[PDB]
């Protein structure tokens, strides 16, 4: 999974996290939509499901 929020060791105990370069957010600027770069993170995790 993707995220833009650094992790907490206590909460994210089942997830392994990486730093996959950078992404870009996009927001209003009056009449035009601009973008600003930010770092991106990668939430790996192995889990089980069933029918």
């Amino acid at each position: 999974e993707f995220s833009i929020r650094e992790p907490n060791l206590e909460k994210h105990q089942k997830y392994t996290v990486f730093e996959a370069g950078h992404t870009t957010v996009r927001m209003k600027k009056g009449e035009s939509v601009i973008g600003r770069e930010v770092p991106l993170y990668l939430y790996c995790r192995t889990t089980a499901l069933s029918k």
Partner: protein, 158 residues
Amino acid sequence: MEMGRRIHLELRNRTPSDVKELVLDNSRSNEGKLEGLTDEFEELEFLSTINVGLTSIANLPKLNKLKKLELSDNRVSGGLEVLAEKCPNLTHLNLSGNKIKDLSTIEPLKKLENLKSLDLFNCEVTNLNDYRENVFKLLPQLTYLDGYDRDDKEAPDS
């Protein structure tokens, strides 16, 4: 490169007492600590330190004529009371991209009576509930936040 050589380069024989602007972007600073700055810089009115692996503010000298600062892309956290003594005449500040967790770290900025605009983007604080309002109630002198005033009034160019 390095703040020392970068600065010595920008200063093309000019004394550190007659400049009105300075830039140090895309450099590196040992220990994430400033190096080479002093009180000699008096006429300085602008500063920009971006993506230099910075983490704290301890070697910052006293700068009075300073009226604008930029610390984006670094990992500063905690030191925000020096501003009330070194740069009391400061108006614009920006910290997007740094390590900021709670509001107690922000409280000292209330003493900057000259403060007009502040920019907080991509910080952990931004992920809270009813944060713009709580900050505004903390810093009444403030009018602009991240480029937007109360009621989402986009600020002009400059």
